[PDB]
Amino acid sequence: ADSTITIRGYVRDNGCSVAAESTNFNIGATTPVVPFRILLSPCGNAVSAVKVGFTGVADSHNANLLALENTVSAASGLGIQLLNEQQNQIPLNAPSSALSWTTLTPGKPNTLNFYARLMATQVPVTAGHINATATFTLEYQ
Amino acid sequence: LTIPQAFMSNRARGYIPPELWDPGINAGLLNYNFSGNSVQNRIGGNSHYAYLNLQSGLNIGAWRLRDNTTWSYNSNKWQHINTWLERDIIPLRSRLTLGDGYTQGDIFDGINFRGAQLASDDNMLPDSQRGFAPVIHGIARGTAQVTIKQNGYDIYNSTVPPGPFTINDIYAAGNSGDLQVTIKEADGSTQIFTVPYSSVPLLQREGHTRYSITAGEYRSGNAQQEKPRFFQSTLLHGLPAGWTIYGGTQLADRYRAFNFGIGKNMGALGALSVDMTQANSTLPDDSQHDGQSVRFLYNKSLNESGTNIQLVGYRYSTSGYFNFADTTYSRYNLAYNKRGKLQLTVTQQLGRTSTLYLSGSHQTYWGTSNVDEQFQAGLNTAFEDINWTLSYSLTKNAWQKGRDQMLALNVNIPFSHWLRSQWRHASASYSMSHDLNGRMTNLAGVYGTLLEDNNLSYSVQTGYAGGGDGNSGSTGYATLNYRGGYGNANIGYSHSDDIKQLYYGVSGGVLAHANGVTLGQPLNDTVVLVKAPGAKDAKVENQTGVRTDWRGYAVLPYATEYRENRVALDTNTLADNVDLDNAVANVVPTRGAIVRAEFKARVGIKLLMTLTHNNKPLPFGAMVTSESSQSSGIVADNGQVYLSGMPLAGKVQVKWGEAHCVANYQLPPESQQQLLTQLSAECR
Amino acid sequence: ADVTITVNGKVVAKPCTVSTTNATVDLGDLYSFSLMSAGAASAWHDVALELTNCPVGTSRVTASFSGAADSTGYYKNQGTAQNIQLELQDDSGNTLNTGATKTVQVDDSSQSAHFPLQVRALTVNGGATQGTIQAVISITYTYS
Amino acid sequence: FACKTANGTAIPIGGGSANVYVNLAPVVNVGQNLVVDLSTQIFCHNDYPETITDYVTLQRGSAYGGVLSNFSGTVKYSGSSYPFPTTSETPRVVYNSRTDKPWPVALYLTPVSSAGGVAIKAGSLIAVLILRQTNNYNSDDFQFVWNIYANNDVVVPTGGCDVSARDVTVTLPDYPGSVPIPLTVYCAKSQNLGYYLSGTTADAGNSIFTNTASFSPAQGVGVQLTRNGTIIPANNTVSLGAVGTSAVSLGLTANYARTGGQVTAGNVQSIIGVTFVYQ
Amino acid sequence: GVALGATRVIYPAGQKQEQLAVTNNDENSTYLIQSWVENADGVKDGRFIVTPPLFAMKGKKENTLRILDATNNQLPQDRESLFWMNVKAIPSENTLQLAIISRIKLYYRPAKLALPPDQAAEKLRFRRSANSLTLINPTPYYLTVTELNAGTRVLENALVPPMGESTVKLPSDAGSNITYRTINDYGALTPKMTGVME
């Protein structure tokens, strides 16, 4: 009528705030699994599916084991094996073709629970400090 | 260790600690607003008017001194208006004002005065602790999960340790309905209970206390009205079970008023607040009177049908009840005081796109049979983008005979409806007003923003009035407003049948600080200064028309007090040689504070060195610092370090452990043109 | 004494002129992660409505607001963005929804009124979907 | 001997004593102002002219009553000018006819003011006269008292000048506006006149009269009076010049004026008093 | 936890630089953000420089990344080009640590394109074969088809190249009609559409 107020704007979509948690610690010896989680919260409404992958230095014994850091006191033939929520080996350095889309519910926080276990293959495995820095790759649709 | 959260000292969501609140900086402040018009008439000639409103101010640490003045010219002297020195008491969550001010009409009537006033501030509370909302009390058998559903949507989800729990962070959203709280135990047992709530304006959250203490001299602005000293104190206290007890008192030489009342959140019956004021008043003719006024307020939230009774109020005052302003006249309708005032405010939702609104006030006086009537009924329809409004108004004053009625129809159509161009930010308005006495006015207008930043706003509206009094005529109003980085301006042209007038005006604010003087748009209560030296024209994003000066300082006219405000600079507008260390800052100001948002803008050529030490790339994470300039960086993969604001030729110090390397470079003199440059270096 | 004159009359309030006829508030680009929880809101944006050349006799101006309000009571969004509403208030913390009226006094020295307001966008149900925001609020003034 | 009037026809009580209800048409005249002309009202006749002839005279002591009791003048008795009040017995008038002949008696008032007057309500006594009637038939002489009463409300002039209306009400247009006040004054003789307003003024210059409105007063505004675009302060004499038998307009024009600060809508009412002073 | 401001970055040809946002909402966490843009083949070629390439974020902080072009108009001007933008947050005792990489699509969009972006999702075509469904896209846009449904079975998502084709595995127990949805330039879901054979 006499005056008008015209309110304009735009609401954009964003990624997922991803929080990771550090994990404390015969041939083919497996230690008890230690669980860790990846929390995606808050996640935008348009975020429907994402690709999750793991990257790191492949072990000399096998490419499916995440090798330890080059510590001055490091155990020989000791790697860290990562298990998914269903207790299956996660392919290290898997390509995008091998990776698959995992769905997320919009609004509610999402959780991805994995396990890590020490695998000894060069028995007798020496005693050394265990340290590893892996990469969690999250590709957006 | 499991402890019930009823006494865990849990913090509300949005709680900002008081130690993070910024008092601001010491500064001088000025707000100028010059307006004028040059009227022209067929009979009478030309006329000129001008008014310059000048508001000065000064912040020294934690105080805020403000002054108002106005210079008026007609066709001629300054005229003081107000002055006040104010501060906020954080420990008391209060605010003290010294000088010209006004009280609050929560309990008694609004009174202007010149004295001292210490009153509690509601803006210091978190956004979830303002208003009224029930405090949900419950018990949990063990570690449980509590979710509160309002209108089917979860508005509160939490995990509660075993034991009794209390929740008091509920947002003030009584219009949505009732809060169904459900507590799920680990085993699976669910406890359900529904809390419905409605609030009148004088209902306080449980345990929350509001107060005001004012002592001063009643300033009226009337030449026949005295200025007596007075002391007024009001208090309100929320209470369990949705109660609220409040009261107050006014004391003066010839007036003593005592008010007491209680409000309740009845729930399914809505909120009701009843109070009573007893006033003993000595009239200007030295005649003592006593009276009692009872006020009821009732509020019902939205129902399933959509109807909400926003307000139903009724106030009844006996013959001897007089207000403070009634006894202040120098030794009038003092025999025609008010019998009773009835207020009604109702809203209905008639479908997905239609809203009906009712408002009304009815005042009856003592002695006379005249009644002050006001009524206003509206119907709004949305369609898709064409907004229709059908309004009706009815006003009758006690001192005049006759009812002023009006029935108006308004249509608003955006031009994006007709289109798929500068006309996207434009729309058309058609008004048809009927006086219900013969008169009829048609009006057609086009308005919208024009410039790239949508600073300029134009509005051209023609119209034709006719009937009723026979004064048929055509009238056109054209308005052009502008919001620049140095202030606002506006022009207007109103061509009536005979009167043709031209309005002009310019307004702005000036800030004086340790770094000089900065001009900008008219300052509001709280101001943010954007100190980014070296950035000539950096657009402060999410703000209209705000740009930095030629030195790098820009004042943001508005900032939310006691809340986190994000001040950002648009990197798309920076020069080719300016790089901000961090383009975004966060400020938490107090009321009236002028807070700097300091930005570090490195000015110079940006470059990306590839450092090699011992024929090997530099290690990851190595720090790099320029000696001549102040630029710094961290070595990324492949030994590449990015440095902003570097000189044409200089030295680089690299440190990665217990300097270790020296790097020298010499770019060509024509390397400034490129936005980013790449080179290679060496070490010892 | 010898002859008496009774001079009657009245002072009536005449309309002023509106300086800001098509005020606009550009909230900018909002982010959906900050408007996810129920009751979450954007930052306050100030809008001021000033009137000038108020004739002598007009001491108060009452502005009535009107707009398309959804089931939540706040002004509806005609843009693509969903689960969002537009909130308007004064500087006194009073919600001026559709049909609400606020009254201000006219400064005698300059004969000008001024309505200090503030606008924002909030989600009540939560989960503000990506999209444009567009709303219009029409304000009509009655002078007394 | 029977006396009667067309309008009232009052019943005589107590012998010859009687009242009367007659209209009043007081007009300012040179020298003195007439008050009541009983010739046009009182009609007397003799029932038996052939047997008894009456003689009616006015004895000394006849005067006014009430508010008029402090005023004097003259009486036209059968065309003879006799000073008033009656300090002596006037010559008698004979009556020997059956016809309702008019009674040649007129009452005047001596001007003691400039232009003021006194208002007399209906039913209030004005004059008390002592009449004595004898007859030629015998020595039957009887004296009675006649009280004159008013059957209408009228203001008899006391000074030597008259005005169009003693009470004038003017309604201004809505703020701002003006209205000419209809008020004229004439006099029986060419004489100088001066008038000054009165009332409870507001400003320090005594020029703006206070807004004395009862219901919903409009604060900050009062009423001024001007003439030929010249402000007239209260209690300041304005000279009308030479005023004769022709009515001279004062030229008064009521206007609004601003007294204090902010002007608030409402009613405005000012009561002003103008008094005339000889010069 | 670090969060990017968008799941896509549309880079118009001829622009000086584009802008993205990173937000760290954790009051106590400390990160080192390292950002880089790789080509469609997943090798860092230096075609786009994210500035600052490596910067430290302390606690709750919101910073801005500037993606700077380096193509110098050496890229095709007739079709959209795809790059991958990676933002890695190195966190900063027998502890395994995780560095989170967030990967988004950078669409280099040449100027003066013929088909509008809005009408690109309607121009796909489908062809069905023995246990394979081929999507052909003649538009000069990279089209992200999601929520594929060949009758009742849900098919995998795909990114069909401009003026190109892609293949999705098709189980035998599939219907005749196919319904698909694409994601526009703003990250929103387009309305469901029905595919056309051949």
Author numbering:
A (entry chain F): 1 to 25, 39 to 154
B (entry chain D): 113 to 187, 196 to 451, 474 to 562, 567 to 804, 808 to 833
C (entry chain G): 1 to 144
D (entry chain H): 1 to 279
E (entry chain C): 1 to 92, 100 to 205
Please quote the authors directly:
Uropathogenic Escherichia coli strains use filamentous type 1 pili to adhere to and invade uroepithelial cells. The pilus consists of a flexible tip fibrillum, formed by the adhesin FimH and the subunits FimG and FimF. The pilus rod is a helical assembly of up to 3000 copies of the main subunit FimA, terminated by a single copy of the subunit FimI that anchors the rod to the assembly platform FimD in the outer membrane. The assembly platform FimD in the outer membrane of uropathogenic E. coli is the catalyst of type 1 pilus assembly.
As a consequence of the fact that incorporation of the first FimA subunit is rate limiting for pilus rod assembly, we obtained a mixture of FimD-rod complexes and FimDHGFC complexes that had not yet incorporated a single FimA after completion of FimD-catalyzed tip assembly. In conformer 1, the structure closely resembles PDB-ID 6E1522, with the NTD remaining unoccupied. However, the resolution did not allow unambiguous assignment of the incorporated subunits. The FimD-rod and FimDHGFC structures provide further insight into pilus assembly and suggest that FimD quickly adopts the post-handover conformation on the periplasmic side, driven by quaternary structure formation of the pilus rod on the extracellular side.
